Design an enzyme around this catalytic site. Structure first.
Site, PDB file in Angstrom:
ATOM      1  CD  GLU A 181      30.873 -26.399  25.471  1.00 23.80           C
ATOM      2  OE1 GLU A 181      30.132 -25.335  25.684  1.00 23.80           O
ATOM      3  OE2 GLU A 181      30.575 -27.333  24.642  1.00 23.80           O
TER       4      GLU A 181
ATOM      5  CD  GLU B 148      28.498 -24.968  17.898  1.00 23.90           C
ATOM      6  OE1 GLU B 148      28.859 -24.272  17.363  1.00 23.90           O
ATOM      7  OE2 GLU B 148      28.849 -25.847  18.787  1.00 23.90           O
ATOM      8  CG  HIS B 149      26.387 -25.998  23.506  1.00 18.56           C
ATOM      9  ND1 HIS B 149      27.037 -26.829  22.591  1.00 18.56           N
ATOM     10  CD2 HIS B 149      27.253 -25.471  24.326  1.00 18.56           C
ATOM     11  CE1 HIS B 149      28.423 -27.094  23.096  1.00 18.56           C
ATOM     12  NE2 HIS B 149      28.667 -26.030  24.292  1.00 18.56           N
TER      13      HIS B 149
END
Lengths: 78, 442
Positions: B134, B57-58
């Protein structure tokens, strides 16, 4: 003393399962019985000794008594 | 009203000889939003494969080979479209929102990601340490960690139990490859859905997808979607104490049915009845939701919320609250008690409101374009098709008291729940206790 005011406990993750999702029976013959002996043999040499000692002092004591009762075949050989 | 529902534009859907299903809803709206919703997630990850879906996703945005970073973004920014997305445990998506005057342009973009991501080995080694940071942030969001831990123990041992984020050790060692090994493995048309809402004319969409998704399935495999390994629910607990924290969180739940199940309705209505509280509200007078009321009167919690988070074949029907180190107990008690009441002596007058309350979220669940696409994106993927508000309506416009009782009890009464609690929880009683809190001394 009630609950919520016992101790400043930080970072202790505990996981436990519902009793219905686990088995109470437990694991005898695996961890069960073993630990039992792990203990009979651990304290046997710390508990039994004195009891054993008593026993002796009991028997000795009793026999001797039961002896001091019987006649000395030679309290009167004449 | 009912007429308002009925006059609501049907949703168009048609799959490709490829596999993708292309659906969407049309309105007047200049704007819109469109996205590909993959049947991908963490659940689909392994012991050493866990994380990818995320680490992915990143990088799903930092470019493709056709158009590297600086350009994609520049092409996206420059046109004023918003390309956002996520990745759960059994659901991942990537939607954009433009002016509908970009269907064909947005669509292409979409395809160019789900299929060709730069995965620049140099881009990765950065996003690596980015996530690892994160993640360290996701961490003090007790509001969440409390849920993963819930999963962690609720579904202990299986695939769900793994958190969408994945262990630090994997994110610290995922290979340029493993990511691709993930992409090529799950990112396939049969499990992906192209959905959209706004001013778009289905056909134009089709053709564009049917145009930029030039996928071709040889084998019978490629055309078949694997069903997932069943996850064992495990009534248990997991306590991550720390009186060092402002307060403790508690989340307990029973196994959920799974999207399919028709009862998820009546059940949904259930959660409507106790709802949620949160000190900002304005109601010690609140609607039935005693949990709410009582939460006020006796200042029980900072906030509590009911949830029926469900998945393909399983679920998590419970409740989560946040409270001072001190009122944790009274809360559970009062709360957990409600479940009982709920499925032992719930009334019509209650369900009446419940319903309408759902029918309000039911509607506002679809508020705008992005959200609508969500359902469409979802609906198909997990349900098979699209559930019209006209349908949901009846579904839950026909749930009577006796039906809620019959349901909740069916999934709550004397069931072994899973509790999760981080924070100063010394006050939360053992399991057996919160366990025998499942049956009402009727």
């Amino acid at each position: 003393r009630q609950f919520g005011h016992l101790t400043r406990v930080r970072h202790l993750i505990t996981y436990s399962l519902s009793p219905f999702e686990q088995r109470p029976f437990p694991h005898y013959f695996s961890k069960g019985v073993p630990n039992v002996w792990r203990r009979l043999r651990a304290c046997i040499l710390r508990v039994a000794p004195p009891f054993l000692a008593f026993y002796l002092l009991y028997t000795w004591g009793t026999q001797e008594f039961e002896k001091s009762k019987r006649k000395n075949p030679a309290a009167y050989v004449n | 009203y009912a007429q308002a529902l009925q006059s609501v534009p049907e949703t168009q859907v048609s799959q490709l000889d490829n596999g993708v299903r292309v659906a969407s809803e049309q309105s007047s709206q200049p704007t819109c939003t469109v996205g590909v919703w993959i049947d991908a997630g963490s659940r689909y990850e392994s012991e050493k494969n866990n994380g990818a879906g995320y680490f992915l996703e990143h990088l799903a945005f930092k470019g493709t080979k056709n158009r590297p970073q600086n350009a994609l973004e520049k092409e996206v920014e420059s046109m004023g479209a918003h390309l956002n997305a996520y990745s759960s445990r059994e659901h991942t998506a990537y939607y954009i929102k433009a002016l509908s005057k970009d269907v064909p342009k947005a669509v292409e973009l979409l395809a160019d990601i789900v299929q060709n991501c730069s995965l620049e080995d140099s881009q990765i080694e950065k996003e690596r340490d980015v996530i690892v940071r994160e993640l360290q942030e996701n961490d003090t969001s007790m509001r969440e960690v409390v849920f993963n831990y819930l999963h962690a123990t609720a579904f202990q041992g299986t695939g769900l139990a793994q958190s969408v984020e994945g262990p630090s050790e994997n994110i610290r060692k995922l290979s340029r490859a493993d990511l691709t090994e993930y992409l090529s493995t799950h990112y396939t048309a049969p499990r992906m859905v192209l959905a959209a809402a706004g001013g778009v004319e289905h056909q134009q969409l089709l053709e564009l997808a049917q145009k930029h998704f030039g996928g071709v399935p040889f084998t019978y495999d490629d055309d078949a979607v694997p069903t997932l390994s069943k996850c064992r629910f495990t009534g248990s607990q997991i306590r991550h104490r720390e009186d060092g924290l402002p307060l403790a969180h508690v989340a307990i739940a029973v196994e959920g049915p799974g999207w399919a199940h028709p009862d998820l309705v009546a059940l949904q209505v259930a959660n409507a009845i106790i709802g949620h509280y949160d000190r900002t509200y304005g109601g010690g007078l609140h609607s039935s939701s005693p949990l709410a009321s009582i939460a006020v009167t006796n200042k029980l919690c900072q906030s509590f919320q009911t949830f029926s988070i469900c998945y393909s074949e399983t679920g998590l029907f419970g409740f989560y609250f946040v409270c001072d180190r001190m009122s944790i107990d009274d809360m559970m008690f009062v709360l957990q008690g409600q479940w009982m009441r709920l499925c032992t002596s719930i009334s019509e007058s209650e369900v009446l409101r419940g319903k309408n309350f759902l029918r309000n979220a039911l509607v506002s669940h679809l508020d705008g374009t992005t959200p609508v696409c969500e359902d469409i994106g979802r609906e198909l993927l997990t349900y098979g098709r699209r559930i019209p508000l006209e349908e949901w309506e009846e579904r839950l416009a026909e749930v009577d008291a006796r039906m809620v009782r019959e349901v909740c009890s069916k999934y709550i009464y004397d069931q072994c729940p899973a509790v999760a609690g981080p924070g100063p929880i010394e006050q939360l009683p053992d399991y057996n206790r919160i366990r025998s809190g499942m049956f009402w001394l009727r």
